[PDB]
Amino acid sequence: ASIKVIGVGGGGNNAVNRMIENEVQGVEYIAVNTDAQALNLSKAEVKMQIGAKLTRGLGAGANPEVGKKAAEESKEQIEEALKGADMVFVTAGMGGGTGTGAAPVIAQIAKDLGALTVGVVTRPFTFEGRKRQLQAAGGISAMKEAVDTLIVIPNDRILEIVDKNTPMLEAFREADNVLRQGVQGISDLIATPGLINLDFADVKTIMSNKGSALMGIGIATGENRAAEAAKKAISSPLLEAAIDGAQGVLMNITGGTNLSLYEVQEAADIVASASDQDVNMIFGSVINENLKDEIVVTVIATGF
Amino acid sequence: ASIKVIGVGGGGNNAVNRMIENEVQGVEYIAVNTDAQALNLSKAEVKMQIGAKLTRGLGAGANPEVGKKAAEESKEQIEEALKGADMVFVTAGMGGGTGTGAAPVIAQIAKDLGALTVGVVTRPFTFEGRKRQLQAAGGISAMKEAVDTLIVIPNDRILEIVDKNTPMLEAFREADNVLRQGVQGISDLIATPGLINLDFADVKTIMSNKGSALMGIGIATGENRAAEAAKKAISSPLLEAAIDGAQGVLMNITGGTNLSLYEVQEAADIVASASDQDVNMIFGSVINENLKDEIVVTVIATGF
């Protein structure tokens, strides 16, 4: 499949950088921004400055209507960058001017090109202030109408996972990495050979015109790791609701070379038992040799 | 010498990235910003978020007084990052909130630590608008009082050099690269073995408490290249004034392996003839093997 990951605005650009840094296979990267400096820091080969006439490379401020207009200014160039894609991941931090306003435009473009369009976006941390929070909710509504499936990750839940003395800059970097795992959790199953892959059509049945979706991540080491990562994924603080409310579930279990098929099934089993009995569930597994005795379960719940 | 290059705000962060990309030797990189996304895109090992309480990682807006206050919030951490430096290059695009306001604070910190403090900053392009232009001039005055030498590069002059159809995003990337060449033109002579190096004390005599400075860059290929690069450097559109107004001049001539000592002298000679008869002039040369038949002359004129 031709898969494109388009990172919109600061947060989205960082997610794309995290993916490049982690050598995610089988995807093309596009970095999009109204801020030319941010964009020139991007490791992506395709760097798309949007709303050059409107913003002059200076960014959108915090106004999402400016981000929207900048994307509208650059419709034709966004179209050209996305032509040929079978699947487009639109990734963004919601709350600011560019992500919140430009991401929904770009998602709708991807859709109008016939791509399976998956949004993977964050709600901002509470410490970013109340206006960012409200703007984000508006962007999330707008995104919902423009994508096939929209994964929303609340950044405040990251803080319930990480060390309480995690500095602000590292908290932001953790959110980039969650966005990365939301994209890569799906993509790797279609596009990276591992232990169990999925056909694009399986993923599509789960994501196509489904609306709201959630993500849980579970990490565990050593004995009982498969059961524990699974139980941790399905109870992840990242989950805004329980996965039994979902029409579809996708599970990715990623491990090192000691990951076994019976471990994958036992994770799958736990996830299936947690899901609706009439869920459509699919799952796969890939190997990352940097992992030793710890595995990672990522669960995407679609169609709430 | 312990040399630190501290890039402040978007433009400054990009300059530091350009240096890292070009494997500049013998310097430590610090990336500084109020915008946590930009900063997390930086390739520098030391990433310093300033004004975390004041700005929440959201940036300074376009208000330089916010950049100033953010730096003031983080004085202690800026001090800790700069301790031990013999020379500090503070690099920034002037015009916006963070560079314009934070850079002068950081320069004065470097000075109060005993560093030879060289500012290398740009005036913004006219297309960035009139307010950015005015703010920039204010920042440049503020910087002048805080550094030993302040190199100012007008971005609009880049446009007189590059192709008229150069896209906006690439114009910005060209300004980053000019800032890079202003830093690296000095640093390489002290810190990278080549054909003729300078002692730190020579450079210091030229830069210390000198105030305003200018830069010219000349590039030429093949026959007569040394004479031509030199004549092009001394007549560079980047120069806001003629170099004969300077108390000091530094020349760096960089070439591939066919660069000769007699070529270096003949460049030096041209630059000396263009300078005041009572200039203090110093010069050096280094080799970059990616250069074939083209050489690069960079001239820094100090003490106007």
Author numbering:
A (entry chain A), B (entry chain A): 12 to 315
In the authors' words:
We examined three globular proteins from three phylogenetically disparate sources including: FtsZ, the cell division protein from B. subtilis; NS5B, the RNA-dependent RNA polymerase from Hepatitis C Virus; and P38α, a human protein kinase. Based on this analysis we defined a truncated form of B. subtilis FtsZ spanning residues Ala12-Ile316 (termed "FtsZ truncated"). Specifically, we used Gene Composer to define structure-guided protein constructs for crystallization studies and showed that we were unable to obtain protein crystals of full length FtsZ, but did obtain multiple crystal hits from the truncated, engineered FtsZ construct.
